[PDB]
Design a protein around this ligand. Structure first.
Ligand SMILES: NC(=O)C1=CN([C@@H]2O[C@H](COP(=O)(O)OP(=O)(O)OC[C@H]3O[C@@H](n4cnc5c(N)ncnc54)[C@H](OP(=O)(O)O)[C@@H]3O)[C@@H](O)[C@H]2O)C=CC1
Ligand SMILES: *P(=O)(O)OCC(C)(C)[C@@H](O)C(=O)NCCC(=O)NCCSC(C)=O
Length: 1374
């Protein structure tokens, strides 16, 4: 109605700086933005200039978020009431801000900060001051992405009190920099969006005028944060009592890929090896049964045949001989159908071969046989391609080992892949999505070819071609020396003359190129029936290796001999054992000049000069020349040294060999010049040869599936939490730190109350409406008592189980009581009478504890009084009635339907139909006001809101008490709580349980008395198993029926005093650190170390020893070290480099004096970057002190007592240079690999070990100061999410890196899908509602404003979470 403001976010608009203010990629309109809009509107209403007006806003609620549209225009409709001052910023029919704005001509500023002249932060050292770089590192880690216009604070103190805010003319930015003093006054790790500024004064007549136009050296106005009054003041601005709401963090990039750098043998892999085929017992049994099906079926073909219709009839008869050589129909299917319908968990992903064998066999013998079934089997060809037998040599592990080992050894910049015969056996469907979509250093070229057009290869990044694959001598001459890798999936068998086929195909391979073949080698009669129908002809020429089986196919042993006979070198060979078999072949390499061997065994780098000289001649040598780096010991970082060296010299003449002495078999290799084992290696000419576990292989990074990050394993102590906040379908069971004895959240306030606690084993956990409210996002955990801020979880309070002595007990404890073990204060634990089962006792404590608090403690009920109870059927409602009846009260209750009324009457016979009303409408007021004869009700237990709350107040007697225990309070009544206008009684039982003072003991005595006197009686119950936690929570939320919901954790024993049997529960990982153990963080005072030490402190660590070469040398370090000490952590900062056994002893001496050493982390780095040839000895060994010299001295200490018995974690941070390499960092690659091998010797001996192998990381360190080797930097809040996975894992090194990535109907769908965090909208189901995937409270508003910004649709927020993708598509068209 009033002034409409147009925010122009264009390329050169003056308000283009408003885009330099984002929260994890969300470009929101500043909360102080609405303050200026309201401020300017009032001035325009008054007619004065907005800079000459002194205003004061009160209770500025940011009702909803405004998402600024980049490169566009947003409109708001500020409206100010003339005399009252009620201002309102809105956009259409949606509210965006509210409050009251008032102008005045007198002093509006409370604090006397507009008078300060200079800056208190003068003359202070650099280690007692924060600067612009360090202040906004703190904000960035919390999700606040400030740009250059919003980076006002130039300096500050370690206390955050004094600042040097900059004044540059813009008011929306200045008021935000004053609101940043509030945010950096509350150190933490979560992301909070301000939503209520209780008072703001912007008196501009005491504020310096706008800078003279053209200024660049803007002045700085001293500011200060008043922790007493909660006032942030700077110049002529003050913001007082600003509150915020926690928000979940959004990942701007895509999820990381985690791999497992592990050794993988090349030839004849044993079952225990990683390159071995994936043959579980279930698959082998399926092949046996299915092979029997082929045997039994093929018998029927030669029995029913009477018209001579069987294609290639003679072949089937010949094949049956093989089946009998390597040995009813109804039983054959019976066995398979038993396997096809079982759900024991040992099932195969799908049974495709049988579906193809069944359709062919079951098909009838009659006319058009050959053509009819040749057109039907071809339609189910997907079954043969996607089958467990065939998917055993196409699994991700084997496919990657193939493509990467080829990529490493191809000495060009583009990997050319040519597959011939792609219509029958396609290898692009496996090669591309499993191995070639993870490439980041080599670009690939895939060419599919066959007789016709490849239909299924249409969606893949391939190029098509046409020639005859089944006939040689006709392959186009344009393909000579055209591909580095040749793929022949199920193609060589269809040739008639193999010798003519191989010799011609070998002309395809470039010099040093590779060839790949997949063929059936064992049990050759199993797949024939499909082949017989599909193959037009089955006539082929045998060879010296033997006559071709059937007309096509050749036994594995024959293939190997044939390829060997034709002068091929077997680089790899993976025999599946059930059917197919893979060969990866390459021609021999005969050097014309003797190879050069340089032993790189030494770790002191006595070989550096030799390598430097002999690698400087690589650019002027014969192509056949080579340089081999040989290491005959386990500890040698030559696999990262080469991979970084090959970046500066090419892969034509750089090779390495590493013999692992520890794992070398009884016959170790004898690689020495004119040796025997060496000559074999030279012929293969592979860039990476490692002898480990008695086989030649290569170190490869195998991708860890994303499903394993949430895999559940047995755990003794577990507790329920949520994976994503605000989603009730994401509740899982995580590991509980109570395995360490103590509990998380022992920081800050929780250390002031030294309550004596009894460790209890939870048998039943009660579910209240408090837990559902927190779980489904209706309330953030910050509303709870401050003592629960750092707790592991906030779900569950009541329980019933057995104490440490075996007695049966029940009570209330600070959360999480929804666990299997709790530490309940001894003053909150009642004893179960010897008439209630542990199931019944789980319903009493909270329901009756709140009933007594509402009536006897807060309402002061008296005998004969009249009480009004809302929601009589609820658990607290039922408890309230029982207490009141014991007090001989007159009861009026609100019952939803007649079932609830009947239920209550049955439970309490004293209730007639006169004591019941209806909650459907506020018609009870007349009834209660007539039956009480106008006196009203003495006590009102209120849960309903809105008009029912008003009517309930009006029923109060003159001395009546109103107890409001509802959870979904309004906005005005939420302000009342903040400003101390009303008391917040909806989380008082929680607050009492933290303190457990005189107020609580009154309730403990009352409930305890109630048990004895018979008032306290168990309520109705509904037990839910542990795994049905999600269903239990939904049942409580719906409130479709009355009764308690209790989760059964264990089974109550028959005895009454007996020990709890030790059992395990399935739960997700959660790393925890012992509070009584000291943790060493070597080099932990920098970048990732300080933000990792923060993570450990939140997860249990309370004893840290941070080590550095100098000490605390920056203001950011001194601030966080002071922050930890404030939280109750004992931090000792040592300025000692551990580069000598003496120093290592000193560091651990200061450790054992704090507590048993229960962790050693090395996050040290000293980088020197330069080309390998220009680096002297001293310059080379610079990054080799924190990664080699240290890690061996820290390793040695952990191997010797008393640390060995006590040590629990041993983490050695590494980088991707070990697996990807880099240029100039030959030294850092060498050291980083030796750190990766010292962490595998620990695994051989069984000691704990972990070695994260990171990639570019953001927000903290080296990169912090983007895209290197095409890999995007990770967000640290993800670095710590995967790091938690890394610690609770069995592997040594876990690679973690991030790789960089129409109609109007599809336009908005992609945008809407992007909000939810979906990369392919089409992939997910079109019938699955948004709430099912997950839509918290900010994704819905973004979609709501996007469906209007992008299209004309205007939807409701609630409608967003219950609408499918199909609904959205069908709605935009309308
Ligand atoms: N940052 C990234 O993006 C990546 C990180 N990593 C790994 O993660 C860690 C990153 O830490 P980051 O802080 O980023 O590196 P920084 O260079 O940012 O700081 C590293 C710390 O190492 C400490 N340090 C170096 N040498 C010694 C020594 N001899 N004795 C004690 N302390 C020492 C320094 O303390 P002072 O300066 O006081 O001596 C410095 O604070 C490293 O271990 C690195 O290998 C892996 C891949 C990439
Ligand atoms: P639901 O629980 O209804 O969610 C309420 C939300 C959407 C969080 C709403 O209250 C909101 O968006 N408030 C935030 C307003 C805001 O963005 N203020 C600060 C500006 S951005 C900044 C600090 O970077």
């Amino acid at each position: 109605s009033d002034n409409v403001i147009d925010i122009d976010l264009s390329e050169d608009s003056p308000e283009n700086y408003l885009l330099e203010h984002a929260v994890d990629g969300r470009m929101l309109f500043p909360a102080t933005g609405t303050l200026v809009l309201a401020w300017k509107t009032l001035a325009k209403l008054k007619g004065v200039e907005f800079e000459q007006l002194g205003v004061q806003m009160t209770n500025v609620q940011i009702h909803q978020a405004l998402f600024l549209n980049p490169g566009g225009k947003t409109t708001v409709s500020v409206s100010v009431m003339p005399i009252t001052g009620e201002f309102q910023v809105r956009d259409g029919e949606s509210l965006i801000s509210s409050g009251v704005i008032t102008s005045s001509e007198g002093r509006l500023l409370e604090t006397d900060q507009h008078m300060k002249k200079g800056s208190v932060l003068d003359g202070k050292p650099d280690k007692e001051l924060l600067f612009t770089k360090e202040i906004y590192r703190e904000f960035l880690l919390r999700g606040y992405e400030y740009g250059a216009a919003f980076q006002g604070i130039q300096r500050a103190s370690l206390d955050a009190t004094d600042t040097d805010i900059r004044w540059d003319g813009r008011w929306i930015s200045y008021l935000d920099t004053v609101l940043q003093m509030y945010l950096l006054s509350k150190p933490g790790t979560h992301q909070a969006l301000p939503t209520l500024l209780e008072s703001v004064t912007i008196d501009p007549r005491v504020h310096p005028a706008q800078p003279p136009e053209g200024t660049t050296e803007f002045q700085v106005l001293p500011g200060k944060w008043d922790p007493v009054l909660q006032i942030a003041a700077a110049g002529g601005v003050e913001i007082r009592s600003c509150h915020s709401i926690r928000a979940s963090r959004r990942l701007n990039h895509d999820p990381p890929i985690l791999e497992d750098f592990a050794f993988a043998p090349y030839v004849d892999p044993r079952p225990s090896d990683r390159s071995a085929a994936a043959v579980t017992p279930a698959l082998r049994d399926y092949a046996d049964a299915c092979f029997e099906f082929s045997r039994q079926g093929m018998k029927r073909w030669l029995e029913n045949d009477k018209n001579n219709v069987l294609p290639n009839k003679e072949e089937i008869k010949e094949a049956l001989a093989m089946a009998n050589k390597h040995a009813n129909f109804a039983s054959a299917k019976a066995t398979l159908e038993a396997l096809v319908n079982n759900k024991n968990g040992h099932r195969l992903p799908n049974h495709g071969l049988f579906e193809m064998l069944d359709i062919a066999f079951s098909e009838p013998l009659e006319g058009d046989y050959w053509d009819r079934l040749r057109m039907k089997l071809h339609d189910v060809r997907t079954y043969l391609w996607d089958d467990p037998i065939i998917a055993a040599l196409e699994s991700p592990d084997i496919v990657k080992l193939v493509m990467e080992t080829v990529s490493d050894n191809v000495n060009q910049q583009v990997m050319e892949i040519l597959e011939v015969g792609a219509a029958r056996g396609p290898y692009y469907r496996q090669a591309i999505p499993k191995a070639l979509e993870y490439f980041s250093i080599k670009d690939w070229q895939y060419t599919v070819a066959d007789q016709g057009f490849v239909e299924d290869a249409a969606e893949f990044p391939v190029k098509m071609m046409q020639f005859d694959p089944l006939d040689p001598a006709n392959f186009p001459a344009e393909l000579t020396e055209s591909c580095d890798l040749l793929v022949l999936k199920w193609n060589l068998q269809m040739q008639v003359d193999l010798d003519a086929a191989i010799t011609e195909f070998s002309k395809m391979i470039k010099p040093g190129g590779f060839l790949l073949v997949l063929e059936n080698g064992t049990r050759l009669s199993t797949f024939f029936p499909i082949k017989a129908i599909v193959s037009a002809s089955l006539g082929g020429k045998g060879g010296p290796e033997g006559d071709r089986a059937m007309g096509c196919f050749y036994t594995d042993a024959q293939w190997s001999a044939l390829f060997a006979r034709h002068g091929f070198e077997q680089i790899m060979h993976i025999p599946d054992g059930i059917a197919v078999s893979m060969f990866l072949l390459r021609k021999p390499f005969e050097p014309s000049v003797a190879p050069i061997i340089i032993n790189v065994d030494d770790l002191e780098c006595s070989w550096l000069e030799e390598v430097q000289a002999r690698c400087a001649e690589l650019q002027d040598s014969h192509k056949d020349s080579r340089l081999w780096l040989v290491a005959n010991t386990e500890l040698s970082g030559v696999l990262g040294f080469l991979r970084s060296l090959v970046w500066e010299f090419g892969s034509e003449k750089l090779r390495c060999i590493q013999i692992d002495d520890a794992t070398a078999g009884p016959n170790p290799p004898k690689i020495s010049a004119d040796s025997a084992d060496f000559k074999e290696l030279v012929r293969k000419d592979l860039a990476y040869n490692v002898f480990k576990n008695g086989k030649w292989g290569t170190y490869r990074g195998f991708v860890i599936s994303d499903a394993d990050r949430q895999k559940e394993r047995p755990s003794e102590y577990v507790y329920a939490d949520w994976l994503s906040a605000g989603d009730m379908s994401s509740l899982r069971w995580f590991d509980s730190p109570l395995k360490t004895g103590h509990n998380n959240g022992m920081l800050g306030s929780k250390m002031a109350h030294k309550l004596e606690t009894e460790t209890c084993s939870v048998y039943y956990a009660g579910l209240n409406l408090r837990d559902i409210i927190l779980a489904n996002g209706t309330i953030q955990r910050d509303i709870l008592p401050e003592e629960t801020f750092f707790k592991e979880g906030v779900l569950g309070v009541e329980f019933s189980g057995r104490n440490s002595s075996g007695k049966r007990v029940m009570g209330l404890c600070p959360p999480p009581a929804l666990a299997t073990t709790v530490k309940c204060p001894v003053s909150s634990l009642w004893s179960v009478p010897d008439q209630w089962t542990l199931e019944e006792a789980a319903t009493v404590p909270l329901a009756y504890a709140t009933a007594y608090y509402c009536l006897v403690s807060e309402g002061g009920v008296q005998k004969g009084a009249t009480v009004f109870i809302h929601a009589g059927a609820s658990v607290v409602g039922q408890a309230s009635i029982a207490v009141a009846l014991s007090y001989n009260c007159e009861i009026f209750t609100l019952t939803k339907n007649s079932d609830e009324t009947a239920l209550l009457k049955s439970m309490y016979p004293q209730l007639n139909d006169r004591n019941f009303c209806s909650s459907e409408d506020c018609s009870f007021e007349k009834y209660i006001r007539k039956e009480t004869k106008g006196s009203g009700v003495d006590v009102v237990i209120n849960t309903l809101r809105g008009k029912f709350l008003k009517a309930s107040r009006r029923l109060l007697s003159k001395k009546g008490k109103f107890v409001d225990i509802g959870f979904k309070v309004d906005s005005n009544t939420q302000i009342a709580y903040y400003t101390r206008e009303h008391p917040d009684l909806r989380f008082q039982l929680d607050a009492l349980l933290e303190s457990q003072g005189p107020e609580w003991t009154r309730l403990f005595d009352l409930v305890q008395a109630g048990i004895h006197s018979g008032v306290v009686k168990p309520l109705k119950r509904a037990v839910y198993s542990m795994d049905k936690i999600v269903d239990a929570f939904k049942t409580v939320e719906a409130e479709r029926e009355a009764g308690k919901i209790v989760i059964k954790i264990r089974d109550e024993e028959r005895q009454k005093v007996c020990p709890t049997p030790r059992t395990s529960f399935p739960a997700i990982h959660r790393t925890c650190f012992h509070p009584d153990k000291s943790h060493i963080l070597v080099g932990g005072m920098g970048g990732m170390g300080l933000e990792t030490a923060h993570w450990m402190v939140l997860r249990g660590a309370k004893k840290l020893i941070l080590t550095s070469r100098y000490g605390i040398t920056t203001g950011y370090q001194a601030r966080k070290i002071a922050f930890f000490k404030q939280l109750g952590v004992e931090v000792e900062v040592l300025a000692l480099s551990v580069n000598t056994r003496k120093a290592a002893d000193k560091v651990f001496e200061h450790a054992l004096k704090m507590g048993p050493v229960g962790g050693i982390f090395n996050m040290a780095m000293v980088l020197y970057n330069d080309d390998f040839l220009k680096m002297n000895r001293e310059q080379f060994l610079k990054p080799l002190e924190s990664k080699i010299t240290m890690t061996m001295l820290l390793d040695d200490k952990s191997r010797e007592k008393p640390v060995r018995d006590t040590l629990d974690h041993f983490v050695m941070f590494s980088s991707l240079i070990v697996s990807g390499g880099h240029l100039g960092q030959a030294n850092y690659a060498f050291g980083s690999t030796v750190l990766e091998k010292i962490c595998e010797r620990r695994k051989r001996d069984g000691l704990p070990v972990t070695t994260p192998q990171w990639a570019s990381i953001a927000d903290v360190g080296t990169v912090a100061l983007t895209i290197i080797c095409r890999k995007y930097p990770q967000r640290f809040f993800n670095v710590l999410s995967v790091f938690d996975f890394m610690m609770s894992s069995d592997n040594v090194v876990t690679i973690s890196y991030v790789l960089v990535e129409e109609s109007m109907v599809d336009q908005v769908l992609r945008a809407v899908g992007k909000v939810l965090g979906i990369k392919d909208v089409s992939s997910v189901d079109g019938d699955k509602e948004f709430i099912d995937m997950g839509v918290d409270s900010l994704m819905s508003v973004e979609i709501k404003q996007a469906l209007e910004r992008d299209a004309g649709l205007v939807i409701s927020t609630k409608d967003t979470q219950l609408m499918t993708f199909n609904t959205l598509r069908s709605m935009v068209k309308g």
